């Protein structure tokens, strides 16, 4: 069996998914049994078969190249390697084949991107994909624990202490790497991550760039609006697509229902649609509100929801590791392509 | 001056109507409040509430309705027969061809041919029309795709109290969101109810036969009527989120002519009732919590689509109780007066 290391174990969801994995694990190392935390160093990866990184991009950039040198296969959570052409950017249900050519690092994609890809791939493979327009409804746990705690503090201030939302002091949201901070309580902030020079944020541009790489098609037009709302866990997305050929809605529903990792929750006669609160704790991606555009013959709207820490992060990383194992790809890399 | 009546004066809906009227420039000589002996203020005066009836509209020049559909269907026609001009708040008359559906900054000219009832549009639709009309008049509009982020105050006071209760049960008593009991949201008149706290519910109003909801279809049909162009393609997704007041909207358009973003920004900034909040260098964009209490519609995140040459995305926010309802209605009354249109209608076109 494998020696699996979790870098950034202090991270919790990574551990839980690994406890329930079908991966054959002889030894766990953190860098119902107590495990000592070892320091992350350049020589700490000897004998490790698989390393799941769940620290920041700084930890991945420095140490992931040394893991590959030592013979490890790295699954990186961060954004640092996602647009490196020597690194596969993988959602196992969509593009597992891209794992075959790996050079020791497989990047886990952005959370909002992953769930959209699970929903849209079954549609793409039957009727094609020309464009995507998405507006997201993203939970604060995407911005980390500090954001979660801030959201709860703000809500308690409003509800128990009578503070008006606009008078709340904030220190993290919308972004811990930007100059100004605004309340999320009873609000919708149309900013995730910081702005780029084309007036889309990095989150929005990640949905564009990562979609193109995952589906291996630069011709798919993608434009996104990414919005933070007062939800702790689970991202929701209003997704619009135009297919290459007309996809009957009955057949779209059937295709999504059969697709691994996706659950059709779509029965409007009984008010059944995906909901954030229902998706928490589950590995699945829930899809519904599926219907034709009222004017464009090839347009389709839908509503997509998933736990942003599971399929959106920790589960996708562990599932990649399971797929690596299934495909015979857990082994040392010959040529080192990272400094 | 005018005799003005507020029909449904005791609502939380009626309260906002009263507030806007109190701040109006409309020359009011007499105010009357109609509902189901009690007292409510108008400015410095105590006004005695009277019962809404078929005969309660005599001598009234303008009636602002602020109740429900049943009250408008039943009593608005009798107001017209009594010589009143009615501004109706509900959806009941919006799609009637004899009834102007008006956002004063957009289609005030449609008021001129009124037959005694002008309908206030749906809140989510109004703010979209304020943001998009300055763009349409310079570059045209071919299509719209909208995804909304709607506050619970649009479903009424009960929906607000339910949202606050659910949130307190989670944060104060440690109840899990999926263990919450809901009675109203997403829709009081539908069979099943779900928690809104820490949730996003993609249902506003009930489902129609085409699997869009009524809220979504209202955005489609009302847009077509207001802009007087059935060729504008409009599709919507309407979602409720844990916000008490102010709707936000992610809006995508395609214009008929390429509209330079700097010019689109300037056009919206110059348009009455719209405020440009767009400076991403200093993280300036519209926010629900900032819009509460203002009559303005705020527009930002304006940017070209990454691929479609005539595509534009933006972010539109306004207080759903003010421009989305009570202020649009009072503004219609002010505009009727402005244009010399407060008059009895000779021919009754609505069934009693």
TrEMBL record, chain A:
Pathway where it operates: Amino-acid biosynthesis; L-lysine biosynthesis via DAP pathway; (S)-tetrahydrodipicolinate from L-aspartate: step 2/4; Amino-acid biosynthesis; L-threonine biosynthesis; L-threonine from L-aspartate: step 2/5; Amino-acid biosynthesis; L-methionine biosynthesis via de novo pathway; L-homoserine from L-aspartate: step 2/3
Active site positions: 111, 235
GO biological process: 'de novo' L-methionine biosynthetic process; diaminopimelate biosynthetic process; isoleucine biosynthetic process; lysine biosynthetic process via diaminopimelate; threonine biosynthetic process
Positions annotated to bind substrate: 138, 228
Pfam family membership, one: Semialdhyde_dhC
Residues annotated as binding NADP(+): 141-142, 308
Chain positions recorded as NADP(+) 1 binding sites: 10, 54, 111, 145
SUPFAM superfamilies: Glyceraldehyde-3-phosphate dehydrogenase-like, C-terminal domain, NAD(P)-binding Rossmann-fold domains
Gene3D superfamilies: Dihydrodipicolinate Reductase, domain 2 (3.30.360.10), NAD(P)-binding Rossmann-like Domain (3.40.50.720)
Residue ranges annotated for the Semialdehyde dehydrogenase NAD-binding domain, each copy included: 3-102
Gene Ontology molecular function terms on file: aspartate-semialdehyde dehydrogenase activity; NAD binding; NADP binding; protein dimerization activity
KW rRNA processing (keyword) present: no
Catalytic activity: L-aspartate 4-semialdehyde + phosphate + NADP(+) = 4-phospho-L-aspartate + NADPH + H(+)
Domain of life: Bacteria
Binding site for phosphate: 82
Binding site for NADP(+) 3: 10, 54, 77, 109, 111, 145
The keyword Glycoprotein appears for this protein: no
EC number: 1.2.1.11
Residues binding NADP(+) 2: 10, 145-146
Keywords from the named record: Amino-acid biosynthesis, Diaminopimelate biosynthesis, Lysine biosynthesis, Methionine biosynthesis, NADP, Nucleotide-binding, Oxidoreductase, Threonine biosynthesis
Sequence similarity: Belongs to the aspartate-semialdehyde dehydrogenase family.
The protein's role, per its UniProt record: Catalyzes the NADPH-dependent formation of L-aspartate-semialdehyde (L-ASA) by the reductive dephosphorylation of L-aspartyl-4-phosphate.
Assembly information from the UniProt record: Homodimer.
NCBIfam families found in the cross-reference section: asd_B, PRK14874.1
The protein, known as: Aspartate-semialdehyde dehydrogenase
Organism encoding this protein: Streptococcus pneumoniae (strain ATCC BAA-255 / R6)
Name of the coding gene: asd
């Amino acid at each position: 069996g494998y020696t699996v290391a979790v870098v950034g174990a202090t991270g919790a969801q990574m551990i839980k998914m690994l406890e329930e994995s079908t991966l054959p694990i002889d030894k766990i190392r953190y860098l119902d049994q107590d495990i000592t935390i070892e320091e992350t160093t350049e020589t700490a990866f000897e004998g490790v078969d698989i390393a799941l990184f769940s620290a920041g991009s700084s930890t991945s950039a420095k140490y992931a190249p040394y893991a590959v040198k030592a013979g490890v296969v790295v699954v990186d959570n961060t954004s640092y390697f996602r647009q490196n052409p020597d690194v596969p950017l993988v959602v196992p249900e969509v593009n597992a084949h891209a794992l075959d050519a790996h050079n020791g690092i497989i990047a886990c994609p952005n959370c909002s991107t992953i769930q959209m890809m699970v929903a849209l791939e079954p549609v793409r493979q039957k009727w094609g994909l020309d464009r995507i327009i998405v507006s997201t409804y993203q939970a604060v746990s995407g911005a980390g624990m500090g954001a979660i705690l801030e959201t709860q503090r703000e809500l308690r201030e409003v509800l128990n202490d009578g503070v008006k939302p606009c008078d709340l002091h904030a220190e993290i949201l919308p972004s811990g790497g930007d100059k100004k901070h605004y309340p999320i309580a009873f609000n919708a902030l149309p900013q995730i991550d910081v702005f780029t020079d084309n007036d889309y944020t990095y989150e929005e541009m990640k949905m564009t760039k990562e979609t193109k790489k995952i589906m291996e098609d630069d011709s798919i037009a993608v434009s996104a609006t990414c919005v933070r709302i007062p939800v702790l866990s689970a991202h929701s997305e209003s997704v619009y697509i135009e297919t290459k050929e007309v996809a009957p809605i009955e057949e779209v529903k059937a295709a999504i229902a059969a697709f691994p990792g996706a659950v059709l929750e779509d029965d409007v006669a009984h008010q059944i649609y995906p909901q954030a609160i229902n998706a928490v704790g589950s590995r699945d991606t829930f899809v519904g509100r599926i219907r034709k555009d009222l004017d464009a013959e090839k347009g389709i709207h839908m509503w997509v929801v998933s736990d942003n820490l599971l399929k959106g992060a920790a589960w996708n990383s562990v599932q990649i590791a399971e797929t690596l194992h299934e495909r015979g790809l857990v082994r040392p890399t010959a040529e080192l392509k990272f400094e």
